[PDB]
Amino acid sequence: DWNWTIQQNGLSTMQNNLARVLRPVRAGITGDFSAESQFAGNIEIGAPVPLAA
Amino acid sequence: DGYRCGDKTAIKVSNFAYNLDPDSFKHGDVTQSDRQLVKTVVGWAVNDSDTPQ
C-alpha cells in the first residue's frame, strides 16, 4: 500500500528519493571476453591457373 | 658367411602419390560401360502471360 507510505512519510519525501534511486547510470565498461570450445575455421579461393579450354 | 646365413634385409616400395602439377592435366574421353535405370521424370511448363518468367 503505497498510499500508506505516503501518509506516513510524505509524498514529496519519497517522490524525491525515488528519483535518487532510479536515475540512470552512465558508464564506460572496460575489460574483455573469453569462451571455451567454440568453433572456428576458414575458407580460401586460391589463384587461377590459366589452363582449360 | 658371417652370423646368420641369408636372412637378408629388404627394401620395400609401398604406396606412392602424385603432386599433380596444375600446369598440366589432360582429361580424356568419358564413357560408361553399362546401364541401369533408376528413375526419371518428364513434364513441362507454360507461360500464359505477356512477360518472360
Task: Encode burial over B2-16: b for 16+ CB neighbours within 10 A, e otherwise.
Answer: eeeeeeeeeeeeeee
CA distance A33 to A50: 46
User: In terms of C-beta density within 10 A (0-12 exposed, 13-18 middle, 19 or more buried), how is residue A6 classed?
Assistant: middle
Cβ–Cβ < 8 Å for A48, B22: no
Which B residues 7-26 touch A at CB under 8 Å? 22-25
Q: Distance between CA A22 and CA A18 in Å, rounded?
A: 6
Task: State which approach was used to obtain the coordinates.
Answer: cryo-EM
**CA angle at B37 for the pair B32 and B40, rounded to the nearest 5°:** 115
Q: Which residues of A touch B23 (CB under 8 A)?
A: 49, 51
How far does the CA of residue A46 sit from the closest CA of chain B (Å)? 12
